[PDB]
């Protein structure tokens, strides 16, 4: 089943490598969807009602708009972006994957992440320019790698990250 977070900010429905979010932002409700391979989100607000979001919360069935997006039937005014492969250095650990986008202050970013030894190991990449990468290991949330990427803060080298991966 999806986990559900409901707040004044919106509704977020999560699985290890999938997220459906409906965010209450300037002038209405915006949606974002991603799985392991595709990200889709709206450039204009969409009409998805609180009742449909509550029915998703209760039944676990996504709203019809999301089922159409999953089937490749995209609404007007949306962006569709292909995601980079799962980070090869983490692939053996079955990592989680989330995307963060402009709705929450990020240039569109994909993060692969695991918990190991009481620490988060995460690799964040810009979706449009996947060579821009931040490798992170620390006590914070997976979003830390995306923040360091946003702020041009130095991250771990390939070699240091792989050594941290070796210990689990």
Residue 114 to residues 17, 42, 55, 152, 163: CA-CA distances in angstroms?
Answer: 12, 29, 31, 23, 15
Domain that holds residue 12: 3-81
Same domain, residue pair 89 and 65: no
Measured between alpha carbons, how far is 36 from 18 in angstroms, rounded to an integer? Answer: 7
Name the experimental technique. X-ray
Please tell me whether residues 69 and 22 are part of one structural domain: yes
The answer to whether residues 120 and 53 belong to one domain is no
Chosen domain end from 57, 81, 105: 81
**Domain boundary at 81, 114, 133, which?**
81
75 and 111 in a single domain? The answer is: no
Total structural domains within the chain: 2
Query: Does residue 72 share a domain with residue 89?
Result: no
Measure the CA angle with vertex 110, ends 67 and 164; round to 5°.
135
On whether the CB atoms of residues 137 and 120 are closer than 8 A, the answer is: yes
DSSP of the chain:
--EEEEETTEEEEEETTEEEEEEEETTEEEEEEE-SSEEEEESS-----HHHHHHHHHH-PPPHHHHHHHTT-PPSSEEEEEPPPPPTTTGGG--EEEEE-GGGT-SSEEEEEEEETTEEEEEEEESSSTT-EEEEEESS-THHHHHHHHHT---B-HHHHHHHHH--
Resolution of the experimental structure, in angstroms: 1.8
- Cβ atoms 58, 87 nearer than 8 A: no
| Residues 49, 91 within the same domain | no
């Amino acid at each position: 089943m999806y986990s559900v977070k409901k707040s004044k900010s919106g509704y977020i429905f999560d699985k290890p490598r999938e997220r459906i979010a409906f965010m209450f932002l300037k002038d209405g409700t915006y949606f974002m969807y991603h799985d392991g391979r595709i990200l889709c989100y709206s450039l204009k607000p969409v009409d998805v009602s609180r009742e449909e979001l509550e029915e998703f919360e209760r039944t676990g069935e996504p709203p019809e708009l999301i089922k159409r997006v999953k089937a490749g039937k995209y609404p007007e005014n949306c962006v569709v972006k292909e995601l980079p492969p799962i980070d090869k250095g983490l692939a053996q650990l079955n990592p989680n994957r989330k995307c963060v986008i402009i709705f929450t202050g990020f240039q569109d970013t994909v993060i692969d992440y695991v918990e190991c030894n009481g620490e988060t190991l995460a690799v964040a990449r810009l979706i449009d320019e996947p060579g821009k990468v931040c490798r992170f290991a620390g006590k914070g949330n997976y979003k830390v790698a995306a923040v360091k990427l946003k702020r041009n803060e130095p991250c771990l080298t390939r070699e240091e990250f792989l050594k941290k991966v070796e210990e689990c």
